[PDB]
Amino acid sequence: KLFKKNNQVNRVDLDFLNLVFTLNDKDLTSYHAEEISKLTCVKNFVEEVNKLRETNKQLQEEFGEASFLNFQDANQYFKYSNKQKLEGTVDMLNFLKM
Amino acid sequence: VTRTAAHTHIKGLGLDESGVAKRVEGGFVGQIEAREACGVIVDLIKAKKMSGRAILLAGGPSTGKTALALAISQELGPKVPFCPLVGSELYSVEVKKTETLMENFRRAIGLRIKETKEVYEEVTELTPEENPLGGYGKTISHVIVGLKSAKGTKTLRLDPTIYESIQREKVSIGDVIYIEANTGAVKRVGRSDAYATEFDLETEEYVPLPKGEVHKKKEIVQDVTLHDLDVANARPQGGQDV
Amino acid sequence: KALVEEIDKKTYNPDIYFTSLDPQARRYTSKHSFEERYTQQEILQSDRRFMELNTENFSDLPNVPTLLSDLTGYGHGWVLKPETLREIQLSYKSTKLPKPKRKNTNRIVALKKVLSSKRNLHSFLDSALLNLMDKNVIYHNVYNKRYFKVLPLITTCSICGGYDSISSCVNCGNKICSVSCFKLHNETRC
Amino acid sequence: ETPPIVIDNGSYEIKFGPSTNKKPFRALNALAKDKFGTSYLSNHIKNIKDISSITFRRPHELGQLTLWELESCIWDYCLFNPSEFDGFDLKEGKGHHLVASESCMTLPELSKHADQVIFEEYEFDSLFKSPVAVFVPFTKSYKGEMRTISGKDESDYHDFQLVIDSGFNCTWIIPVLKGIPYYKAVKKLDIGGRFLTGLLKETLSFRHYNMMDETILVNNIKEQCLFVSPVSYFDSFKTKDKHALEYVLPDFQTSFLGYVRNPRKENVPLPEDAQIITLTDELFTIPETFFHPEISQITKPGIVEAILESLSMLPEIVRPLMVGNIVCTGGNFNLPNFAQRLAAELQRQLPTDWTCHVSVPEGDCALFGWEVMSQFAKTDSYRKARVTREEYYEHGPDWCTKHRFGYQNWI
Amino acid sequence: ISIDKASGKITKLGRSFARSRDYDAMGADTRFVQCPEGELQKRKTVVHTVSLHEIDVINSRTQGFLALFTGDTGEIRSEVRDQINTKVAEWKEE
Ligand SMILES: Nc1ncnc2c1ncn2[C@@H]1O[C@H](COP(=O)(O)OP(=O)(O)O)[C@@H](O)[C@H]1O
Ligand SMILES: Nc1ncnc2c1ncn2[C@@H]1O[C@H](COP(=O)(O)OP(=O)(O)O)[C@@H](O)[C@H]1O
Ligand code: BEF
Ligand SMILES: [Mg+2]
């Protein structure tokens, strides 16, 4: 009990980085992996990211002058909603990227 | 509560940019030529520009070879790897000594890796429930699971594998988890303090309530050599059967 | 455990183990809202204690029946005393302009009938100056519906304020920490 | 006559005096009597030397006062006196601009009794009776002082605001929507000033000799020592030894008040003949029952539950803005770090989307609200909010507390 | 019961005494054991002395008592000794 406490502090997931290869050949075949790798490179998840980036940047260019301000989220009738939608789309986009 | 053994009186070569040494500095006195050569060699080392350099020094006992070695090891800092081991340790038993020398060369070379990871964490509420669409009995693939944390609660459903991870952790409604979304499994912080005190005694730790917003995100930087990766890959890490 | 140890299939239920030295010779029993936790008698007692807590001294100490009737639907005989009311005509002798500037209407009479009306919230309930639903939208407009706990409980020490080395009594069931407090707990709390 | 006059009514005292002036007129709306038959005035108890027994016959009942023969006379004794209350004077009221900001939380019949006694006995002309909570957001209109505190980490008046007024008899919470309150959510915390006095005296009865007769003793010690825990409960008790006072009792005959010698200060090597009650383990019981009333063995959940219910009652059109506009007023919020602790525990309760904005003035917030309304009435907003002299007789006055100047107008 | 919170293995010390005379007729037989003496609860800063052998064999294998008793540790590796060096240094510093 005096040792195992720094586990989550500085753990880098080796399995998530695909370095447990010696234990991955039990249910792996070459053609399936190559087909997936060919049909992996972007081209499926960056499109909606750009779609949301478009609306985020167009609302931030002019309507984003006082959008995200918390005082605007305090003293206003629509800028609070502008802050809410700006933070919502920011979280959506960075979650999609990750 | 201190122990000094023929060392800890040395902290560096004590040089400058112009290769000028100091007569009494860093626990080293004298040896102008040796200090100049060591400074030049460590300056070449710091550039990471080469590999396989070698040098032999002729020094009698107590002349200061080990002191120079320790000083040069401290020149590059704790993070730069080093493994000065006795020459009689080569003659091992369970592995041929040339293989050991290759293993030491593998250990010596360093690297710095990193990874960014997210994680969610007590449980506010719980609502469990897809169709078989055929001859299958049923299809359970989504369950809303609460996530209390401290700074805000954000319940969310994911792949069912996270649900079976919840049963694997055997966490109650008033139990805190630490679920790194990279794998969908569970890391257990422990029980919670809110739904606690159900009894006067508990061997299981009550565990402090998690601090911060539930959708935790962080990045980790670790300097790990390659031989650790080799030995980790050599042996299995999981399994459930005999 | 001791592998393949002596056992005769006597109980061995993982959640049943009852033993004693036989001073009573018995065995184990067999056969987030506070409104859905305990009954109403104890909450009524707590409300009565809190209404006594409202009472500050001899002036309101016997006012508990009035407070109870309000909630459930020379010390307190109203602020009318001649040593307070009839004297105040000279207590402002520093300077004042007490003058009659008012006509003669039923409002002017209500200035005096309501002045020393000897009327309370209880009389308001017993009178028709306000209708029935006004007292409801005065009472029910305040109380909540279901949210009773969203952060845990503290359960502080009853007499002292200790946080650790805590323990309850055998039969009183009152929270305490120091065994020193038990000396007065089994005498005035148990 | 342009300048108005502002009265800040309440359930223990009122803040009267002209809106032009910025200094308080504290009329202590609470009578009493001593242990020798007769009865004192409203604001002469402090000068007497009888602290052995106390009897508190105030006009205010549990919630509100329900008689007017002497308390209206007390209001005359305070308002109508221009000698002790220099400069300020309400000679008759014929053209006087009074805003008697009554506790509109009273019954409409109470509102009408007040309205009749001010329109006939005072014979008033100008009136716009709304709670001071209506007039608090006037800080932005002029140069206003306020500490901007966020709990995320350790007309011309402002439009949106949710308010929490605190007092002696009661403490209430209300969302003032767009400047008009939403009295369908009139919330009250069951504890109050007299409740706190009783709690302290009962807790110290188990710690020292009787304070039930000497309740003013408890009042003084509460004034001098009690405060809100900076962070939490357990973190405050773990080092009670470094802050454990010793109340030195007053010389009951000659001394006006007692005092306390501080373990943190060696400046007082002077003892007293009267015994010293060692105040050791009773400080932290009180400040938490404001946040966690179960310590006071009551069915009241807590201020966190009440405020989250109040905000959830409000729609997203204002509720994020409503948390973005929160002000706590009243005397009890002069207790240090109440706002910071409340904001921190709410930010714990509040999810990661609602930014926190809680504003509490430094000092007695009742006086701050009174002076904010004084500045309000210095401006013309009341002058379009007042009622003319011809708005009382030709129609039943009850209509005024039904559609215009009554809590049912804002339910 | 010398119970430990982070153990889960409650140790029973035998029998114990009350301060009651039980019933009226002849009785109180068969009672001669050690009675609890100390407080109901008190902290014990228990000191244990172990060598680097036990710590290293714990590091090498999930179970370490078997190799400590039987004696088949199995030539534990160097990074174990390095991490134990760092851990002991910081434990002394803490
Ligand atoms: N030039 C020097 N200045 C200070 N100390 C020295 C010097 N040379 C040697 N020493 C000290 O002498 C001790 C023994 O040296 P040693 O390691 O036996 O030298 P060598 O490796 O040449 O045999 C070391 O602890 C070191 O601190
Ligand atoms: N610094 C302070 N800390 C705590 N409470 C305070 C402080 N200053 C004033 N108060 C409280 O504020 C109350 C004044 O409120 P008031 O409006 O007179 O009550 P009511 O409306 O019931 O007549 C006092 O009873 C007092 O307990
Ligand atoms: F008038 Be109170 F006590 F809020
Ligand atoms: Mg107030």
Ligand SMILES: [Zn+2]
């Ligand atoms: Zn105690």
Ligand SMILES: [Zn+2]
């Ligand atoms: Zn008991």
